[PDB]
Amino acid sequence: EYTIVDGEEYIEEIKKLDREISYSFVRFPISYEEYEERHEELFESLLSQGEHKFFVALNERSELLGHVWICITLDTVDYVKIAYIYDIEVVKWARGLGIGSALLRKAEEWAKERGAKKIVLRVEIDNPAVKWYEERGYKARALIMEKPI
Amino acid sequence: EYTIVDGEEYIEEIKKLDREISYSFVRFPISYEEYEERHEELFESLLSQGEHKFFVALNERSELLGHVWICITLDTVDYVKIAYIYDIEVVKWARGLGIGSALLRKAEEWAKERGAKKIVLRVEIDNPAVKWYEERGYKARALIMEKPI
């Protein structure tokens, strides 16, 4: 059992959980020490400018079950207000309870209240979650292309 | 490609890598913040008792590739000096270069210098690592039995 509330006071815990989770997806042979510093840098960098909102899912003991990180910004193609989701993460043992879906609905509701015209997010092309988002009304508009150098 | 040296100077980096690695095997529904605090507590209490030795594998940029943590203690059945291996860990992208194998040889060599009569360690029962140790002269002497309450 859980509630979804503002997560401003949980940013440190969110940062640490994100660091733990994200490491398994890194494709370059960097040291964990190098990863930690870069993760810290990027996280603060993204957090430093703009209108951010965190929602957290908490249990009865106020422990962190998951979060969504939203940023209100301008669309680089449409030049309208949008809500960009940086991530949605759920603790491994709490997955299957519908918490991620609930956090997304909450984000979508907050976005509309703030006057956003779209929710926008990045999904890895190999990730089976693409279908999960499509079922929830998300459509791929663009590709992130990469070349190694 | 890599060297094996004393790892006293790398304890903080070892601790963080072990924190990252160990979290995958936690079978109880605890928060990551809870895990982190308990991991720190336990690491410190083990490090406080006995004679400890660390070896690290370092690449050309002096990045941590892996480590072994050795404790010289007494055997609870035979009452002879032994070296207990708390940990041997190699980073995911450095696996398959015999680094783990080399770290264990160094540990065995150091244990012998200290007058240990055995190397002892714990391996999880359905872990494929069981055969890896068996190949190197290790034999199962006892079982860690557990009952949930």
Decide the pairing of beta strands A51-58 and A64-74.
Answer: antiparallel
| Residue at token pair 């190098």 | A34
Please, are residues B107 and B55 in contact by the beta-carbon 8 Å criterion?
A: yes
Tokens representing B5 are 């040296």
Query: Touching check for A9 and chain B: CB below 8 Å?
Result: no
- Report resolution (Å) to 1 decimal: 1.9
DSSP A129-147: HHHHHHHTT----------
Residues of B in contact with A23 (CB under 8 A): 20
Q: What is the 3-state secondary structure (H, E, C) of B118-136?
A: CEEECCCCCCCHHHHHHHC
**Of A12, A19, A32, A92, which to mutate for an interface test with B (greatest number of B Cβ within 10 Å)?**
A32
Amino acid, res. B42? L
Could you give the CA distance from residue B36 to residue A12 in angstroms, rounded to a whole number? 13
Residues of B in contact with A34 (CB under 8 A): 63
Could you give the CA distance from residue A52 to residue A8 in angstroms, rounded to a whole number? 9
Decide the pairing of beta strands B64-74 and B81-90.
Answer: antiparallel
Query: Touching check for A93 and chain B: CB below 8 Å?
Result: yes
Residues of B in contact with A11 (CB under 8 A): none
Asked how this structure was determined, the answer is X-ray
Short-list B85, B84, B80, CA closest to B115:
B80
Amino acid, res. B111? A
- Facing residue for B31 by CB, picked from A33, A36, A63: A63
Tell me whether residues A32 and B20 touch, CB distance under 8 A.
yes
- Domains detected in chain A: 1-139 (3.40.630.30)
Distance from CA of B149 to the nearest CA of A (A): 19
Tokens representing B111 are 């244990």
Tell me whether residues B20 and A23 touch, CB distance under 8 A.
yes
